[PDB]
Each structure stands twice: as structure tokens, then as C-alpha cells.
């Protein structure tokens, strides 16, 4: 399709080799493999295929997500290497992220990273989101499951399935979504900052599910009433406060992504600050 070729290179399939299946998505399988670049350098890639017998809607959605991804060239946003559309199966080829989805990676390593390592992950996510927001997009699905992490623990924003341009022109990830976006579809970069606060909690909780298994209706009611997720075990005060700030009821009082990046950069620059750690509550969620 022409739409995708504005922002995606058409790859020659002879330059793509497939190694093994590493996942499955809405649209088909995901494999690891290799791509030979025009310079003859070979790089590791992920290869997503559109399932045989796809509908035209599935093809548009599949390629549409690539068209959005291809608009971003940033170290903390998943890199699109290109697409294959002139032969079938249709393919999307992206940089390989050895350690997979961030939530599942952290669950394998409960309490095994240093606070500075976790802050490094969080800073990358924030930097990617700062660029995404600079580019006029709202992601709408920012969550640990939609961050990929590579062999050197660099985290990158992925999954542009719900993303859109902020303009005057389906199911929602309720637990990750701001109260105003739930209430009346008010999606802004500040609603992505809310979601970032949730990702911050997910990371400091080593991939615990936000609000655990609370019903979505209770998540909506509790959050609207002013309840918030409690501090993760051994969570630095600085980082819990950042969560609370991301979760301000008034979206205009939330920090911008640029401010989040700056905050994390200071914590990285002054790691002793992380040593001040965040008790008896009448409820599991904290009021305020």
C-alpha cells in the first residue's frame, strides 16, 4: 500500500532470513531473524507476518501501525527497518529486542535489578514518549507490555495499534487510561503522562498488574474518588512522588514528558537520592 511507503522502505525478501518463532500477535506470528542491509551489514531483526487469508481491514490495520512507527526515528522508539508488501506473506521488519516485553521480563527477575538499572529503563521510556508527544501523537496504550527491552536493557516504546495524531478528527486499556480519557475520551499528551505513571508503578513492582485483579468498574470508581496505587516495596520516595504527580486529577498539573526525563536524569546523576524509601492504611489503594 502507498500509505505505508511514505514512511517505510520496501525490503527485498532475499535479504531477510528467519530464525525462529518468538511470539504471536493479532495479525500473525512474530519471528527473530536477520536482515542484510544495502551496505552488506547484517543485523538482528524481528519479523511480523500478516496471516494467510487476511481481510483488507486486517491488512490496513497491520500496515497502518507500521506507517505510524516509521514516522519516528528515535533511540527509545522501536525502529522500523522496512516492510515487504510486493510479495506475500506481507511483513513488518523491526529492530530485534532480545529481552522481549518489559512486563514479562521484569516478572522473571523480581527484586533482581538495582534501583539505578530500573531508573535507566524508565528514563528511556520517558525519552521515547517525549519524542512521540513532540511529534503530535497520543499513544493511548502506554503500558509495560507495550515496551520492548534489548540485551543492554534499553527500553523502547512499541505497539502503535491505538496511537493517533492529536486532531479535531474501540476497547480501551482501562487500567492504564487517565480518568478524563475514561470519562469522556479526553486523550492528550497529559493522558499519556498518566499512563506513564502506571508504567512507572509496573516497573518498580517488577511487572505486577496495575490494580491487581480489581474489576475495571472498581478501578474506574476508585481512581475517580482519588484513590491511587500504593508504593511498591522498597520504592524510592522520589519515584513514588513522580507516580503521584503523573496521577494528578487535573491533567494540567501533571509533568510534561520533558520534565519527567529531567527528573530521572537528576536521579541517575545523584543516585544517593534514591536511598530515601517510601505503612498502615485502612485500604489497599491509597486515598491521594
Amino acid at each position: 500500500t502507498q500509505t505505508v511507503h511514505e514512511f517505510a522502505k520496501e525490503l527485498d525478501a532475499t535479504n531477510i532470513s528467519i530464525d525462529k518463532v518468538v511470539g504471536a500477535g493479532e495479525f500473525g506470528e512474530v519471528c527473530s531473524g536477520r536482515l542484510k542491509l544495502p551496505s552488506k551489514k547484517e543485523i538482528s531483526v524481528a519479523i511480523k507476518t500478516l496471516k494467510v487469508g487476511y481481510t483488507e481491514k486486517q491488512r490496513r490495520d497491520f500496515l497502518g501501525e507500521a506507517s505510524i512507527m516509521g514516522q519516528f526515528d528515535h533511540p527509545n522508539i522501536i525502529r522500523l527497518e522496512g516492510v515487504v508488501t510486493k510479495s506475500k506473506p506481507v511483513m513488518i521488519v523491526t529492530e530485534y529486542m532480545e529481552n522481549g516485553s518489559l512486563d514479562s521480563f521484569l516478572r522473571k527477575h523480581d527484586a533482581q535489578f538495582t534501583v539505578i538499572q530500573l531508573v535507566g529503563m524508565l528514563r528511556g521510556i520517558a525519552s521515547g514518549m517525549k519524542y512521540l508527544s513532540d511529534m503530535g501523537y497520543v499513544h493511548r496504550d502506554l503500558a509495560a507490555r507495550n515496551i520492548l527491552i534489548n540485551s543492554n536493557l534499553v527500553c523502547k516504546v512499541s505497539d502503535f495499534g491505538l496511537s493517533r495524531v492529536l486532531e479535531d478528527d474501540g476497547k480501551i486499556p482501562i487500567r492504564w487510561t487517565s480518568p478524563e480519557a475514561i470519562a469522556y475520551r479526553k486523550f492528550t499528551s497529559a493522558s499519556d503522562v498518566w499512563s506513564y505513571g502506571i508504567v512507572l508503578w509496573e516497573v518498580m513492582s517488577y511487572g505486577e498488574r496495575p490494580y491487581w485483579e480489581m474489576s475495571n468498574q472498581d478501578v474506574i470508581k476508585a481512581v475517580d474518588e482519588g484513590y491511587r496505587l500504593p508504593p511498591p516495596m522498597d520504592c524510592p520516595a522520589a519515584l513514588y512522588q513522580l507516580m503521584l504527580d503523573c496521577w494528578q486529577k487535573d491533567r494540567n498539573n501533571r509533568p510534561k514528558f520533558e520534565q519527567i526525563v529531567s527528573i530521572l536524569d537528576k536521579l541517575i546523576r545523584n543516585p544517593g537520592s534514591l536511598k530515601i524509601i517510601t505503612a498502615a492504611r485502612p485500604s489497599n489503594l491509597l486515598l491521594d
Partner: peptide, 9 residues
Amino acid sequence: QWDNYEYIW
């Protein structure tokens, strides 16, 4: 984790 995405009823 089955109800990550949902409508509001």
C-alpha cells in the same frame, strides 16, 4: 489479564 482492554458498560 484477559480484561486489559474493555468497553465501559
